[PDB]
Design a protein around this ligand. Structure first.
Ligand SMILES: CCN1C(=O)C(C)(C)COc2cc(N(CC(F)(F)F)S(=O)(=O)c3ccc(C)c(C)c3)ccc21
Length: 219
């Protein structure tokens, strides 16, 4: 029952989203003032990474629970669980970020309120921030429903092509169930057209590269 697979993906996503959609949208009005901006800009490059590293660690814990509730994930062998979360958790965080992005004025939700890329100057990788803003922007352009994003993020996480799986047959099968769930849910509702506008897979991996490995220094 593929429909059960959908229903679970959707339910867990609802349960693990970490920030509800209605509060992200209600909070689009609370925008950081120039003094709050400055305030973040004057932090040290250490402090700012400590800070965002915490948040990224928290968000990662939610994705872990998303898979923990994913029907057929816990079936998988412990090794494969770890490989898939290691290689995909961060990619899913970044896709989940597009909910908290507002394309009307190019701001993101960060620590209670909304602001632009200027907020993150103290990280010192303005190129990378501009890229994270771009990517969210073109992702928000799909106007995904909650159900779409749930199924999407599940495929981001269940990819049998990840270097280092033991039971590569068992993941292909889950990946393949999800593909059919997703493609069929899209076609049933005439949303098929969004498949063309999905980011190319390299783009995600690119974006989730070295700048975010080795963050134990910040713990
Ligand atoms: C630059 C470091 N970094 C990243 O590089 C990825 C690819 C994980 C995406 O952006 C991030 C977001 C976050 N955060 C939250 C979380 F947990 F949802 F990820 S966060 O600190 O709240 C945050 C939100 C939005 C932006 C644009 C940035 C730079 C940070 C932390 C680190 C990163």
């Amino acid at each position: 029952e593929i429909e059960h697979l959908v229903q679970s993906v959707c339910k867990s996503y609802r349960e693990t989203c970490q920030l509800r959609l209605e509060d992200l949208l209600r909070q689009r009005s609370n925008i950081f003032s120039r003094e709050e901006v400055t305030g973040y800009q004057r932090k040290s490059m250490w402090e700012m990474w400590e800070r965002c590293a915490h948040h990224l660690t928290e968000a990662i814990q939610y994705v872990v629970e998303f898979a923990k509730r994913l029907s057929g994930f816990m079936e998988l062998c412990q090794n494969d669980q770890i490989v898939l979360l290691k290689a995909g958790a961060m990619e899913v965080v970044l896709v989940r970020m597009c909910r908290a992005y507002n394309a009307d004025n190019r701001t993101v939700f960060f620590e209670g309120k909304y602001g632009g890329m200027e907020l993150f100057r103290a990280l010192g990788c303005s190129e990378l921030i501009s890229s994270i803003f771009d990517f969210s922007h073109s992702l928000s352009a799909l106007h995904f429903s909650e159900d779409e994003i749930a199924l999407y993020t599940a495929l981001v996480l269940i990819n049998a092509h990840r270097p280092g799986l033991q039971e590569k047959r068992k993941v292909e099968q889950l990946q393949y169930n999800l593909e059919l769930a997703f493609h069929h849910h899209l076609c049933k509702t005439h949303r098929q057209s969004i498949l063309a506008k999905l980011p190319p897979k390299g783009k995600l991996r690119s974006l989730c590269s070295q700048h975010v490995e080795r963050l134990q220094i910040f713990q």
